[PDB]
Amino acid sequence: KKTTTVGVIIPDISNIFYAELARGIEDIATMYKYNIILSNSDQNQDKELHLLNNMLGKQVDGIIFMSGNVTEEHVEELKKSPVPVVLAASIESTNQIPSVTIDYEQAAFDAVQSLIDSGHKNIAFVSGTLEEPINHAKKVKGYKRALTESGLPVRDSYIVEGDYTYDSGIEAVEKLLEEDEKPTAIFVGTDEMALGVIHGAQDRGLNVPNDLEIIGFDNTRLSTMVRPQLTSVVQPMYDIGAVAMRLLTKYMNKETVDSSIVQLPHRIEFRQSTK
Amino acid sequence: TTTVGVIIPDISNIFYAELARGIEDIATMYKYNIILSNSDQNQDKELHLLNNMLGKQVDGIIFMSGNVTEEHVEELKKSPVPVVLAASIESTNQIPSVTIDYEQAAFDAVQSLIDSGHKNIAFVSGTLEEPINHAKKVKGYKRALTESGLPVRDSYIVEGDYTYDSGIEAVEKLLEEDEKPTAIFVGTDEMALGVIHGAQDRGLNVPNDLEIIGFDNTRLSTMVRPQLTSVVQPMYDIGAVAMRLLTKYMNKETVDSSIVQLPHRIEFRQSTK
Numbered sequence: 116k117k118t119t120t121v122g123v124i125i126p127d128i129s130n131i132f133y134a135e136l137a138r139g140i141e142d143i144a145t146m147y148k149y150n151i152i153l154s155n156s157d158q159n160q161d162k163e164l165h166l167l168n169n170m171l172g173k174q175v176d177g178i179i180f181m182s183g184n185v186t187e188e189h190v191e192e193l194k195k196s197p198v199p200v201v202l203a204a205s206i207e208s209t210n211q212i213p214s215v216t217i218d219y220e221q222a223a224f225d226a227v228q229s230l231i232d233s234g235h236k237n238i239a240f241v242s243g244t245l246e247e248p249i250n251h252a253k254k255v256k257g258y259k260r261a262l263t264e265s266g267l268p269v270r271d272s273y274i275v276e277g278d279y280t281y282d283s284g285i286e287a288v289e290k291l292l293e294e295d296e297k298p299t300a301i302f303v304g305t306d307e308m309a310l311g312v313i314h315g316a317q318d319r320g321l322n323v324p325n326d327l328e329i330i331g332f333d334n335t336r337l338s339t340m341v342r343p344q345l346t347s348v349v350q351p352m353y354d355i356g357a358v359a360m361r362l363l364t365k366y367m368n369k370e371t372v373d374s375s376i377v378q379l380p381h382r383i384e385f386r387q388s389t390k
Numbered sequence: 391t392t393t394v395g396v397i398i399p400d401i402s403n404i405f406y407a408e409l410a411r412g413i414e415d416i417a418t419m420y421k422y423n424i425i426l427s428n429s430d431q432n433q434d435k436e437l438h439l440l441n442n443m444l445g446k447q448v449d450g451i452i453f454m455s456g457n458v459t460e461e462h463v464e465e466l467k468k469s470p471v472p473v474v475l476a477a478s479i480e481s482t483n484q485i486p487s488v489t490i491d492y493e494q495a496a497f498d499a500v501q502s503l504i505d506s507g508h509k510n511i512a513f514v515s516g517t518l519e520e521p522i523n524h525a526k527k528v529k530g531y532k533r534a535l536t537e538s539g540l541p542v543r544d545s546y547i548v549e550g551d552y553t554y555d556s557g558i559e560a561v562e563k564l565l566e567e568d569e570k571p572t573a574i575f576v577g578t579d580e581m582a583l584g585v586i587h588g589a590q591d592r593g594l595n596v597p598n599d600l601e602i603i604g605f606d607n608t609r610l611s612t613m614v615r616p617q618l619t620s621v622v623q624p625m626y627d628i629g630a631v632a633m634r635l636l637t638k639y640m641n642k643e644t645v646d647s648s649i650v651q652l653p654h655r656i657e658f659r660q661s662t663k
């Protein structure tokens with residue numbers, strides 16, 4: 116009888132993928148007939164860790180926690196949690212907290228592989244804050260794997276760190292176009308920077324995809340809000356939401372989880388940003 | 391342990407997120423907790439989100455909605471905690487609120503267009519059923535047109551649904567018109583982007599073949615080629631301000647300015663020749 120309420124925390128208002136996913140979670144939650152409280156942490160552990168105390172105080176029965184750096188410190192406070200909490204689209208390398216994500220490493224590799232097969236030999240990578248695991252530990256690595264496996268060179272200058280803003284993407288293409296030999300394809304860590312990559316390349320006079328093929332990531336709304344429409348790695352937001360809910364529900368009902376660390380499949384939605 | 395809840399219709403929408411940014415900033419300044427609720431502008435969900443918020447003992451509420459009905463103010467009057475409407479219109483002004491003159495901002499927009507010698511100017515609006523539209527933006531678009539002696543063409547007023555897609559559709563429709571618009575004023579930036587693309591996709595050039603003026607001036611305004619000329623309604627300020635106004639109430643302070651109205655302007659970019 117007691118209406119169940121789940122807490123959802125996203126790292127920020129910037130990266131629209133998180134917000135969209137939160138929305139995806141809320142959707143699935145509505146059918147369970149659950150309540151949803153959404154908090155924003157601006158990715159500073161403190162607020163994240165306190166939110167874990169603001170969510171209980173606000174009597175939520177469970178939490179879907181999103182984050183770009185679930186440090187071992189997080190893990191500790193987490194395990195101690197009163198209410199069940201599971202991660203959504205967040206790597207937590209120790210595998211000690213229930214989580215559901217896609218295999219980012221494979222996504223990145225498939226994406227660049229995609230371009231290898233198009234005939235590109237020197238492909239650059241514009242990523243997000245390197246300090247975050249999804250980047251330095253998965254996306255950078257799936258990118259490098261793709262190149263080295265195809266016997267391509269791995270230049271340091273071909274991997275540029277941005278800060279998830281559309282502007283960082285622009286500056287990223289400029290730095291890259293100031294390179295000895297330019298890249299013919301650039302894989303970008305998220306759609307918004309990607310949109311910035313397209314644009315900067317388009318303002319310098321380059322044509323997408325005829326001169327520079329670009330693939331983005333997350334497959335957010337921005338994906339189809341550009342010309343040429345952005346082909347992008349798909350991280351199935353509803354799959355994430357659904358799995359995370361049954362998982363969290365099982366927990367709330369004090370059931371058992373045979374698979375606590377679930378990894379959902381991924382695909383690449385191909386559009387006009389690639390030949 | 392102060393904590394305020396806020397009801398917007400969609401945090402994932404870059405538009406409502408910029409507002410959330412100011413809400414959140416004054417929030418951390420005052421060391422305050424924030425809780426968001428997504429409405430999807432669905433009335434039934436608004437009432438619900440309102441009850442849930444009260445049920446969670448929030449000390450204040452920032453509310454934003456496409457249509458603040460009369461039943462809304464009624465139930466919103468029963469609130470034991472201060473409620474301040476952000477970027478939402480409600481004529482009676484009996485619920486404090488911070489906004490901008492939407493009728494004037496709209497007018498100014500289509501007006502700039504008139505100046506550049508535009509005669510057949512259209513309007514890609516959102517759900518007309520919404521007050522901000524039928525009673526403010528649409529109105530002002532008709533005023534600029536008439537005060538300047540222009541043919542207010544009923545088929546030059548297309549209703550989209552705030553999605554980037556309806557803006558694409560609306561262009562195609564406007565292009566199917568016997569008399570093609572020489573320019574288009576769009577209600578939101580998201581639809582504006584849709585308008586620019588639809589046009590370009592049919593082979594047209596902005597601003598040389600079609601000038602387009604958006605409204606909101608979100609970051610989406612700079613994420614298009616050509617860059618969108620848009621009416622500025624500083625969502626971040628509205629929200630920062632809405633929080634400070636709410637805070638006074640919550641702390642039982644004085645508010646000699648119950649309904650605040652921030653100023654507006656037009657950011658001209660390359661969407662306007």
Ligand SMILES: O=S(=O)(O)CCNc1ccccc1
Nearest residue numbers: 143146147353354357358360
């Ligand atoms: O996730 S799948 O099982 O593949 C399709 C699920 N549809 C669904 C089921 C229960 C709740 C919400 C959505």
